[PDB]
């Protein structure tokens, strides 16, 4: 059942990293906007660590 959830960009809040990450529809729905978000919270295994380069658009 499609919930029509946007794929959104979020910025990592590790001050050493600050990289932007494009989330799946599912992860976009799950983000808790009252808590900090960090790269390791991304379930996309290609871009889920602060040591990984930012994706190109």
Q: Residue 1 or residue 56: which is nearer to Zn ion going by CB?
A: 56
**Binding to Zn ion by residue 23, rule CB under 5 A?**
no
Encode 2-50 in three state secondary structure. CCCCCCCEEECCCCCCCCEEECCHHHHHHCCCCCCCCHHHCCCCCCCCC
Among 5, 17, 41, 52, binds Zn ion (CB under 5 A): 17
Is 12 marked as a binding-site residue?
yes
Binding-site entries for Zn(2+): 12, 17, 39, 50
Contacts with Zn ion by CB under 5 A lie at 12, 14, 17, 39, 50
């Amino acid at each position: 059942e499609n919930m029509y959830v946007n794929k959104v960009w979020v910025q990592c809040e590790n001050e050493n990293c600050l990289k932007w990450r494009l989330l799946s529809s599912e992860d976009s729905a799950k983000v808790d906007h009252d808590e900090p978000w960090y790269c390791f919270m991304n379930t996309d295994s290609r871009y889920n660590n602060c040591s990984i380069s930012e994706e190109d658009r």
